[PDB]
Amino acid sequence: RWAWAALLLAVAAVLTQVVWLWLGTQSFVFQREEIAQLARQYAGLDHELAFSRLIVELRRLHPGHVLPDEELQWVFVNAGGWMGAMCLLHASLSEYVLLFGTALGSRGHSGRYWAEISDTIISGTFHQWREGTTKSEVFYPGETVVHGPGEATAVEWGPNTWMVEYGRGVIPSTLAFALADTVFSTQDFLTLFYTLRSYARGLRLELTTYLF
Amino acid sequence: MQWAVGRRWAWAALLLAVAAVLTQVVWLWLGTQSFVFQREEIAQLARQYAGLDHELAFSRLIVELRRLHPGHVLPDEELQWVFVNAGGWMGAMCLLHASLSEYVLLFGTALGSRGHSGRYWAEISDTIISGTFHQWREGTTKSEVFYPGETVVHGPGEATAVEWGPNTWMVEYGRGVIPSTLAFALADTVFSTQDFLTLFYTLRSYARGLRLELTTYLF
Amino acid sequence: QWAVGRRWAWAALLLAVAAVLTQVVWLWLGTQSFVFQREEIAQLARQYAGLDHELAFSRLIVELRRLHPGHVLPDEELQWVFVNAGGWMGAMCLLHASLSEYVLLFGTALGSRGHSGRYWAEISDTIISGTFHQWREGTTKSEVFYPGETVVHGPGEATAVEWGPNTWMVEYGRGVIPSTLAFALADTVFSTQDFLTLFYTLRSYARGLRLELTTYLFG
Ligand SMILES: CCCN1CCC=C(c2cc(-c3ccc(C)cc3)no2)C1
Ligand SMILES: CCCN1CCC=C(c2cc(-c3ccc(C)cc3)no2)C1
Ligand SMILES: CCCN1CCC=C(c2cc(-c3ccc(C)cc3)no2)C1
Numbered sequence A: 001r002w003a004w005a006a007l008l009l010a011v012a013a014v015l016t017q018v019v020w021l022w023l024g025t026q027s028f029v030f031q032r033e034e035i036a037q038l039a040r041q042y043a044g045l046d047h048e049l050a051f052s053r054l055i056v057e058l059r060r061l062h063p064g065h066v067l068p069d070e071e072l073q074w075v076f077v078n079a080g081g082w083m084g085a086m087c088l089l090h091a092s093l094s095e096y097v098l099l100f101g102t103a104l105g106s107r108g109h110s111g112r113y114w115a116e117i118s119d120t121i122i123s124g125t126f127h128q129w130r131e132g133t134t135k136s137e138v139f140y141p142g143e144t145v146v147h148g149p150g151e152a153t154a155v156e157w158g159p160n161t162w163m164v165e166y167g168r169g170v171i172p173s174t175l176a177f178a179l180a181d182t183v184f185s186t187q188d189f190l191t192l193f194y195t196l197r198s199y200a201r202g203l204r205l206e207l208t209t210y211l212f
Numbered sequence B: 001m002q003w004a005v006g007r008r009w010a011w012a013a014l015l016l017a018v019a020a021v022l023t024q025v026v027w028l029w030l031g032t033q034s035f036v037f038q039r040e041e042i043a044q045l046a047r048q049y050a051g052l053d054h055e056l057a058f059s060r061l062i063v064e065l066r067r068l069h070p071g072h073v074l075p076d077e078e079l080q081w082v083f084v085n086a087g088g089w090m091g092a093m094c095l096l097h098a099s100l101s102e103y104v105l106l107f108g109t110a111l112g113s114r115g116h117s118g119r120y121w122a123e124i125s126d127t128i129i130s131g132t133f134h135q136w137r138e139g140t141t142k143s144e145v146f147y148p149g150e151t152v153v154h155g156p157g158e159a160t161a162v163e164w165g166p167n168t169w170m171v172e173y174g175r176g177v178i179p180s181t182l183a184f185a186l187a188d189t190v191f192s193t194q195d196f197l198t199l200f201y202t203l204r205s206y207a208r209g210l211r212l213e214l215t216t217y218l219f
Numbered sequence C: 001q002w003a004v005g006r007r008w009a010w011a012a013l014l015l016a017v018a019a020v021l022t023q024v025v026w027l028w029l030g031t032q033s034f035v036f037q038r039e040e041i042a043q044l045a046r047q048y049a050g051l052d053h054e055l056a057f058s059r060l061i062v063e064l065r066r067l068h069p070g071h072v073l074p075d076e077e078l079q080w081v082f083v084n085a086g087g088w089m090g091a092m093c094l095l096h097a098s099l100s101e102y103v104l105l106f107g108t109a110l111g112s113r114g115h116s117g118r119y120w121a122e123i124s125d126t127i128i129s130g131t132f133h134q135w136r137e138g139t140t141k142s143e144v145f146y147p148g149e150t151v152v153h154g155p156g157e158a159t160a161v162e163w164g165p166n167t168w169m170v171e172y173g174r175g176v177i178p179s180t181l182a183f184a185l186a187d188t189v190f191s192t193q194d195f196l197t198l199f200y201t202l203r204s205y206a207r208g209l210r211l212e213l214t215t216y217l218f219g
Helices: A002-024 A032-042 A047-061 A180-186 A189-211 B007-025 B041-046 B054-068 B178-185 B187-193 B196-215 C008-030 C040-048 C053-067 C177-184 C186-192 C195-218
Strands: A075-079 A082-091 A095-102 A106-109 A115-123 A126-130 A137-139 A144-147 A153-157 A161-169 B082-086 B089-098 B102-109 B113-116 B122-130 B133-137 B144-146 B151-154 B160-164 B168-176 C081-085 C088-097 C101-108 C112-115 C121-129 C132-136 C143-145 C150-153 C159-163 C167-175
Touching (some): A032 A047, A032 A115, A032 A161, A047 A082, A047 A095, A047 A161, A075 A180, A075 A189, A082 A153, A082 A189, A095 A115, A180 A189, A180 B113, A180 C186, B041 B168, B054 B089, B082 B187, B082 B196, B089 B160, B089 C112, B122 B178, B168 B178, B187 C186, C040 C053, C040 C150, C053 C101, C081 C177, C088 C112, C101 C121, C121 C177, C186 C195
Antiparallel strands (some): A082 A095, B102 B168, B113 B160, B133 B144, B133 B160, C088 C101, C121 C150, C132 C143
């Protein structure tokens, strides 16, 4: 039975080799500039219409990578002390695209992620206070703010602020932060479920499209 | 002996009778569900004092609430402002009535606050005496603002983002599984503020409210 | 010579350790010494209030080092680290820290609101710039503090606090300092999950303790 341990790690070595090759020869659906430019084009429109225009345009540029209307949903997000709402459009293990914002405004912890996040503002104001500094910056509609991996900032959204968010990195690691307050502060298990389901729907889509 | 009845059978028949009767009169306890306050009574009552400053408005409301419902309102000896930290927001409450199905309290903030309203197994109504109440309902990308005199109604299972301006005060009425709602109102107190003295104060106010509702029921 | 009971000597020793510990603690309280006087930091920080906070901080650190050599952290150990607690967020720079005292620079560029924390310590905050709103427990009014003013937070007290944008202050603390850190890291553990920040904070404390340990032992 000692040889069975060798066979166990034999196929384990090959499978891990298959995965490694796949993770490295994998390409991305979206470009950072692509998402930013679309949002910048629509920022002058009311956010409701801007959202609709952007979703339609994303679907024609990348069919089979954007969730259907039947699976689009606004779900509150409580994390880092702030509160907003998001609508997931695309979600894989390496990328996501979502609409985010708040009608009341909010402040808190940007989060510390294993990913690069790009927020292009559609309406309102985004205040950013970078770690190590004692001054803040403000971004306005049409402008894109990037959150590098391992960076942590204090953020503030003004009343009625909305943005398109494009994330790239280890996406399942971001859920730990995004659902923290939901678990320990709001106890909103229903919201917790809606979030996980939306991610599942996004993963479901990307899997079928890749398989056709 | 065609009219006679065996004693053993009759004894077991009556046991089935009391069992059938009890299991049915137990059900009517939910049918004879009596709430101490009417659903829109608290709102209609506080809408009258909204013109005053919150300090006098509270005192005159508490007095009026006692006269209308004697033995259902906590005495001045057990009235206390305690902080409330939940859903990312912070305020202070003053419990006036508390049972297992109902509660009435004075709530507000002198600074203002924002956060998650909470999903309760209950129906909550808030009537504004002073300040502003902002509500952002789930699924929408817009908010509504409520002014003094108006009443915000929060149905069961609903979740909204809330914002109170500076110096907003309100009376609050809740109907439903009150102990479960208490789990939310103490969440941030445990995992964010670690204010265990406040935790004690809140639970004590509930115990005082419950003690009153049983000593009134017993006398 | 005689024997003592298994419950007799047990109680006697329980009184013996009671006699020792109580007079040992009282001995400990008597030898207690503080590097900074109760109102020393406040008096010193107010002198630099009104200036650009960068300039005020730099001059203060130089002044503290000159007044208390061996009790202020070197430049290579000074570090701005985010603080998340009680619902609010800001940044701190630890200047001095032991088991009984601490001095730190604190503030926020964005502003913030939340629970002040209920500490086993006496904490004073002298404002260099910006605004400090305080809402005391049991009250329905709030007081605003402007630069040059000092806010004192007594042990066991709990307030709601609000900082305006670009508010900066100097904070001195006196009491059970390790218990205070527990609060300061509450949101970091259960809300932000920022382990890096958590590590930075604990490292800042360790550096303060090390410096205090060396100065105590070797001058
Ligand atoms: C500095 C930018 C930080 N952003 C700010 C805006 C909102 C965030 C945010 C991210 C998410 C999210 C939801 C689902 C999945 C699968 C992944 C991520 N939900 O909300 C984080
Ligand atoms: C949508 C309205 C949500 N409101 C917002 C304001 C404050 C609430 C709130 C509820 C309570 C409370 C305290 C003790 C007991 C036994 C029950 C309830 N204390 O505070 C909940
Ligand atoms: C009543 C004023 C409350 N203040 C408000 C501002 C920030 C505080 C605050 C305290 C600390 C801290 C960091 C390290 C150690 C060893 C001890 C304490 N880090 O931040 C507490």
